[PDB]
Amino acid sequence: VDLTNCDREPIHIPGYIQPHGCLIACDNAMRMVLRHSENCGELLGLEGDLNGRTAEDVLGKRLVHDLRNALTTTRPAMLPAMETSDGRSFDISLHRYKSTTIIEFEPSSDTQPLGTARKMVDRIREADSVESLISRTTRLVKATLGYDRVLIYRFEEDGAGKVVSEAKQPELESFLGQYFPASDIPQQARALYLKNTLRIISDASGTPIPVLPAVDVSGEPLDLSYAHLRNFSPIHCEYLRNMGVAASMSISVIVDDALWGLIVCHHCSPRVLSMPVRIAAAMFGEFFSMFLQVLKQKRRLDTINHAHAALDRFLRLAAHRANLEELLVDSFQDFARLIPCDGVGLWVGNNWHGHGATPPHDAIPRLARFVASVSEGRVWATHALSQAIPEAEIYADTAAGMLAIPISQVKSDYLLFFRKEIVQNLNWAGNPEKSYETGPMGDRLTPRKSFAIWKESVRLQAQPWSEADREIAETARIALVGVAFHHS
Amino acid sequence: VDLTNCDREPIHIPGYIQPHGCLIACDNAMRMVLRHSENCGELLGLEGDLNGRTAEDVLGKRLVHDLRNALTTTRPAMLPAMETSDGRSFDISLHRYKSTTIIEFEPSSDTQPLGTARKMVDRIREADSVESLISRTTRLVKATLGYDRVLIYRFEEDGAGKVVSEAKQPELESFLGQYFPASDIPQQARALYLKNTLRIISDASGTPIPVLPAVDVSGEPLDLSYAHLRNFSPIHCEYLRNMGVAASMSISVIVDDALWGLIVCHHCSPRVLSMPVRIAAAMFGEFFSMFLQVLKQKRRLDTINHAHAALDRFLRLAAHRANLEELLVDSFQDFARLIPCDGVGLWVGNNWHGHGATPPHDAIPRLARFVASVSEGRVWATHALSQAIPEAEIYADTAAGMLAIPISQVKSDYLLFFRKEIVQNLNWAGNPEKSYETGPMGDRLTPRKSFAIWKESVRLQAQPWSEADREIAETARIALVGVAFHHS
Ligand SMILES: *C/C=C1/C(=C/C2=NC(=C\c3[nH]c(/C=C4\NC(=O)C(C=C)=C4C)c(C)c3CCC(=O)O)/C(CCC(=O)O)=C2C)NC(=O)C1C
Numbered sequence: 010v011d012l013t014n015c016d017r018e019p020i021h022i023p024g025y026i027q028p029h030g031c032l033i034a035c036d037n038a039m040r041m042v043l044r045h046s047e048n049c050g051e052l053l054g055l056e057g058d059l060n061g062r063t064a065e066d067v068l069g070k071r072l073v074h075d076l077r078n079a080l081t082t083t084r085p086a087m088l089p090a091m092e093t094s095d096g097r098s099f100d101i102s103l104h105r106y107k108s109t110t111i112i113e114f115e116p117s118s119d120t121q122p123l124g125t126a127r128k129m130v131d132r133i134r135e136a137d138s139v140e141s142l143i144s145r146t147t148r149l150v151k152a153t154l155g156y157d158r159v160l161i162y163r164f165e166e167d168g169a170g171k172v173v174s175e176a177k178q179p180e181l182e183s184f185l186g187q188y189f190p191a192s193d194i195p196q197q198a199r200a201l202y203l204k205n206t207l208r209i210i211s212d213a214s215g216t217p218i219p220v221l222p223a224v225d226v227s228g229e230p231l232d233l234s235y236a237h238l239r240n241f242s243p244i245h246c247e248y249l250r251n252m253g254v255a256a257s258m259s260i261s262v263i264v265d266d267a268l269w270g271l272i273v274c275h276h277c278s279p280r281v282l283s284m285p286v287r288i289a290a291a292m293f294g295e296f297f298s299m300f301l302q303v304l305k306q307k308r309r310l311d312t313i314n315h316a317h318a319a320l321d322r323f324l325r326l327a328a329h330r331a332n333l334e335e336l337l338v339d340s341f342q343d344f345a346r347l348i349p350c351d352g353v354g355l356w357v358g359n360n361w362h363g364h365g366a367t368p369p370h371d372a373i374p375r376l377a378r379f380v381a382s383v384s385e386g387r388v389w390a391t392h393a394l395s396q397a398i399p400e401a402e403i404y405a406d407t408a409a410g411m412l413a414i415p416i417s418q419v420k421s422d423y424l425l426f427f428r429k430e431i432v433q434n435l436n437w438a439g440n441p442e443k444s445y446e447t448g449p450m451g452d453r454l455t456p457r458k459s460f461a462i463w464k465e466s467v468r469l470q471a472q473p474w475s476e477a478d479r480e481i482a483e484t485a486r487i488a489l490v491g492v493a494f495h496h497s
Numbered sequence: 498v499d500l501t502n503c504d505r506e507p508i509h510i511p512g513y514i515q516p517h518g519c520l521i522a523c524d525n526a527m528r529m530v531l532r533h534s535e536n537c538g539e540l541l542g543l544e545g546d547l548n549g550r551t552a553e554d555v556l557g558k559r560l561v562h563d564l565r566n567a568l569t570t571t572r573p574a575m576l577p578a579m580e581t582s583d584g585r586s587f588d589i590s591l592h593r594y595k596s597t598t599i600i601e602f603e604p605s606s607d608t609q610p611l612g613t614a615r616k617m618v619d620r621i622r623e624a625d626s627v628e629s630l631i632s633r634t635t636r637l638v639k640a641t642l643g644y645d646r647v648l649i650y651r652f653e654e655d656g657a658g659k660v661v662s663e664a665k666q667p668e669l670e671s672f673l674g675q676y677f678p679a680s681d682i683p684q685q686a687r688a689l690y691l692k693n694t695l696r697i698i699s700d701a702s703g704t705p706i707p708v709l710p711a712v713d714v715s716g717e718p719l720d721l722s723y724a725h726l727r728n729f730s731p732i733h734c735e736y737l738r739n740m741g742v743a744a745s746m747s748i749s750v751i752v753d754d755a756l757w758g759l760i761v762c763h764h765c766s767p768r769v770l771s772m773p774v775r776i777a778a779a780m781f782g783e784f785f786s787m788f789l790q791v792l793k794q795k796r797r798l799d800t801i802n803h804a805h806a807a808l809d810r811f812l813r814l815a816a817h818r819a820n821l822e823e824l825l826v827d828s829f830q831d832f833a834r835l836i837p838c839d840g841v842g843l844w845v846g847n848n849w850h851g852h853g854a855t856p857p858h859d860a861i862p863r864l865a866r867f868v869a870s871v872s873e874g875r876v877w878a879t880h881a882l883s884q885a886i887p888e889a890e891i892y893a894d895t896a897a898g899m900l901a902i903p904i905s906q907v908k909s910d911y912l913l914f915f916r917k918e919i920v921q922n923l924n925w926a927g928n929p930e931k932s933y934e935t936g937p938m939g940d941r942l943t944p945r946k947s948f949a950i951w952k953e954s955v956r957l958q959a960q961p962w963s964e965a966d967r968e969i970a971e972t973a974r975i976a977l978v979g980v981a982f983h984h985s
């Protein structure tokens with residue numbers, strides 16, 4: 010695996026686990042040990058090979074009975090402070106996937122998992138905005154789980170990631186407002202992150218423990234998709250080492266059954282969280298996901314309500330004026346309140362009126378012509394104007410994205426909304442002087458090169474028009490075409 | 498074509514047109530007459546065959562120049578009061594589809610199309626609810642276009658149609674609140690109705706004029722998809738004759754780029770609308786579609802806002818009470834305000850509390866068990882309970898549909914919403930004594946048998962849970978699981 014084939018890496022079947030625990034794979038109904046981690050002996054105090062030997066021979070009739078009764082769904086069953094025949098005490102993660110029972114053993118903590126979680130969930134459930142929930146969560150998770158850095162990664166439309174909040178040790182460099190490309194988290198990883206709520210890396214520079222056998226008789230590997238001990242891609246491992254990150258923990262933020270983003274915790278020293286703390290963090294993750302979902306819904310409603318109110322106000326004015334074109338010339342800048350834009354313009358009766366960051370005066374008739382061509386009396390929008398009009402590249406720094414609203418059924422009059430190149434709007438709060446030590450596969454696996462690659466990928470492009478933007482533009486079209494008809 | 502193969506009828510290529518006009522098909526660039534209607538001669542005053550003869554030879558160099566310049570999109574170009582070489586005056590519908598130019602001739606009216614339309618659109622654009630827009634539109638269209646009956650057909654989720662408003666002559670029978678099955682308008686018709694804004698039938702018992710040739714050299718038929726003179730299925734023709742309907746006009750209501758339903762006008766006598774009146778009706782259709790869309794959006798917002806307000810109120814109460822289970826037992830009936838239901842129930846700590854039309858007390862533990870099984874801590878909903886629990890058939894008249902909201906992360910407590918069998922809720926304002934004269938293919942093509950077939954198809958089923966219903970239920974889940982956590 011290298012930078013050429015890391016996008017198709019089968020990370021779900023690595024045939025290795027992390028040192029902080031040991032793994033035993035069994036048949037569908039926990040009779041026979043088919044696979045075991047090389048370190049199974051070292052931790053459980055067993056000698057020789059465990060494969061072929063029966064479940065009750067290796068663990069003990071006592072424990073095997075508890076595990077069978079528990080497996081009653083692909084969601085792993087957590088079972089703390091379980092006792093082996095020996096007398097050693099382990100925290101046990103038990104799950105079943107592809108008709109194979111997987112049992113993960115951890116040296117066992119003793120704290121209240123629901124107790125920690127309730128404290129944390131109480132402090133976020135009164136948040137009245139996405140921004141308030143996001144900003145407090147990094148701060149809160151850092152204080153509670155004592156990680157050196159906590160980021161929230163939010164996925165863009167194109168799969169790119171933005172760092173939307175950060176709590177960190179003062180000495181560490183900030184990634185706040187920094188973007189990373191979609192390739193930095195390939196599709197197969199995003200699929201696993203949708204299936205596993207949270208994901209641990211105890212030691213990025215630790216020695217991986219192989220699973221025996223890696224491939225069985227039938228030629229199948231062991232699918233560690235739902236196994237918390239699953240080993241990390243050496244590509245990501247090298248990325249964390251280059252950043253000075255030794256340990257990580259990530260929580261999946263699931264909103265409307267989609268991967269919205271990750272809460273990602275970085276530590277500069279090796280770090281294992283005990284099962285009870287992981288349970289608490291996972292439950293915090295669920296409640297964070299649920300509350301962000303409701304807040305996302307409330308904001309959409311408020312945005313659309315505000316647009317409806319603005320349009321009602323405008324329709325009430327339109328009735329009292331005789332000349333609608335006069336009212337539009339005076340009013341058009343006020344429509345910038347409806348949809349986030351860096352500039353708005355009115356093209357009415359082959360005349361141009363601008364406000365904010367619009368293309369130059371001479372460029373407008375070409376655009377207007379183009380809009381009349383493809384619009385077909387519907388809202389038209391692009392985040393990449395130069396891809397539609399190559400000569401539009403020249404003014405991308407001012408207007409890289411456009412949304413056109415037809416304001417007349419009869420004539421080709423348009424209300425145009427403009428967005429600057431997304432690179433212009435960067436409020437990046439990082440250090441450009443900060444250099445990173447690289448490994449075998451070069452400086453590609455550094456936040457500096459990642460950010461540079463993203464910047465290249467969004468050249469001459471604006472912030473994409475959201476679904477909310479297009480809903481409001483459609484409601485505005487119907488309102489403006491509606492009164493344009495009344496005034497004819 | 499008969500009741501066995503009428504669902505796959507190729508209505509777009511019938512090889513016939515209606516008598517109230519004549520049709521000439523030409524090559525992609527209007528050089529050569531490839532096809533013509535048999536009645537082309539009778540109306541235009543030409544002798545013999547027109548096929549093979551050039552465009553300029555049959556129409557005249559004067560007219561052919563105007564038609565070419567006009568065809569500058571698959572949307573037909575309307576051109577009233579055009580003059581032939583002869584001196585006769587025609588209204589001309591010109592369109593191009595599958596690289597074939599189709600020209601439709603009508604004996605030409607003289608009224609203002611934009612004038613009529615503006616009067617009508619003014620009277621609907623101040624409607625503040627869907628119900629107000631719907632009720633006034635049938636009344637308005639009847640008064641303006643003088644049709645004997647005007648219905649609005651609204652398509653259900655399953656493709657079935659409901660008659661949601663009606664203006665009619667007092668002597669005629671009412672179809673208000675009556676449903677018809679999805680098969681009464683097959684998929685290929687719904688596809689055409691999405692492509693053609695409005696659709697005329699001048700005379701259901703008129704003689705269809707054939708197109709010559711029906712099939713050309715290459716073996717292709719003439720696609721009359723966008724032709725207003727296209728002839729109707731003999732199946733539908735027989736349906737209208739059995740109802741005593743001689744003429745029809747239908748307008749497509751397009752909402753969020755989907756076929757929402759039809760404005761359908763029935764006349765007991767033959768009836769042609771002139772091109773200028775059709776243009777007006779088509780523009781009224783567009784504005785009706787646009788205003789219903791905005792009103793649909795406003796109602797969804799209001800519904801979701803109201804739910805958010807109710808939940809805030811409930812969360813404010815939950816803070817002041819100590820015992821949440823006590824509050825739920827006292828309050829649960831109030832959640833019936835959030836989602837339209839005929840009954841609501843609380844299943845908390847293996848205890849049942851009912852309100853309205855719920856299943857019997859003894860049936861609840863079975864349901865509760867089933868819900869805990871399939872729910873997996875997400876909102877679960879069916880409109881057909883007996884399909885999931887066969888023994889639930891017994892109480893379908895009281896509860897045929899259920900939506901279950903999990904109110905706890907930890908225990909299997911549920912808030913259950915119930916809907917009666919959809920047949921129970923019928924506010925049908927029609928005449929069951931009214932019998933219909935049938936034709937060759939029997940009593941299937943009567944509103945009485947259509948309604949009977951629909952009733953059979955929705956037996957043991959409730960009104961489906963809308964997207965709005967499920968959004969609110971999800972927000973309620975997050976609110977109730979949220980405070981259940983705080984109180985543990
Ligand atoms: C060519 C393939 C590459 C690649 C693969 C890869 N990434 C994985 C996980 C992953 N990658 C990131 C990226 C970042 N984290 C940061 O903090 C920053 C910058 C500050 C970046 C750019 C992250 C956050 C993650 C975690 C994903 C998660 O835990 O859900 C993985 C899977 C790792 C695993 O096995 O758990 C793979 C494979 N990364 C590359 O950069 C490239 C080019």
Ligand SMILES: *C/C=C1/C(=C/C2=NC(=C\c3[nH]c(/C=C4\NC(=O)C(C=C)=C4C)c(C)c3CCC(=O)O)/C(CCC(=O)O)=C2C)NC(=O)C1C
Binds near residue numbers: 503728733736759947
């Ligand atoms: C087996 C096929 C059948 C069928 C085919 C068919 N229906 C078509 C159009 C159409 N059908 C209805 C149905 C009704 N109109 C009413 O007023 C009532 C009851 C009061 C009913 C049940 C309607 C309204 C329409 C008009 C559709 C439109 O104009 O968009 C067509 C196409 C007609 C055409 O060529 O324009 C076909 C084919 N109808 C059957 O009942 C059955 C079984």
